[PDB]
């Protein structure tokens, strides 16, 4: 939340985002902007490259090609609205080696 009547927590405005890039740090800005702001987990079906739920791809009627993945909530919301406009991001994933 934002206010002081409501609870707060300050903003990492875009100028700070550059500052953190500047030093050359990498986990710090990941932590500040994903672990402790809107950390969230989803699942996707690798065959169709689109998100599902509970390890069950409603599109494919299967549970084999599903996988779980961590993603900022605001990014998940972005995928939904874009799909809502029929602009479907069919994301592609692989092993993390």
């Amino acid at each position: 939340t934002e206010g002081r009547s409501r609870d707060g927590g300050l903003r990492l405005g875009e100028m700070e985002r550059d500052c953190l890039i500047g030093y050359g740090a990498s986990m710090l800005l990941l932590e500040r902007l994903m672990i402790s702001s809107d950390a969230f987990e989803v699942d996707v079906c690798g065959q169709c490259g689109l998100l599902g739920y509970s390890g069950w791809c409603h599109y494919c009627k299967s549970s084999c090609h599903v996988s779980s993945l961590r993603i900022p909530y605001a990014c998940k919301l972005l995928f939904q609205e874009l799909q809502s406009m029929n602009i479907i991001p069919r994301l592609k994933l692989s092993k993390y080696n």
Binding site: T1, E2, G3, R6, D7
Partner: protein, 55 residues
């Protein structure tokens, strides 16, 4: 009822800003964090009479 102890001494309580429900009998959280509206959408709020909503 408390899953750890089965009692019913649960009392809703808040830390400095964390709303939570704690089994006061044994100190075991069972429901914490909530989601609420914001003042940014407060000025955007409208109203439709339920009769008009029901057609």
């Amino acid at each position: 009822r408390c899953p750890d102890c089965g009692s019913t001494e649960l009392v809703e309580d808040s830390h400095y800003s964390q709303s939570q429900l704690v089994c006061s009998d044994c100190g075991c959280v069972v429901t914490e964090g909530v989601l609420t509206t914001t003042f940014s959408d407060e000025g955007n709020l409208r109203e439709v009479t339920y009769s008009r909503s029901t057609g």
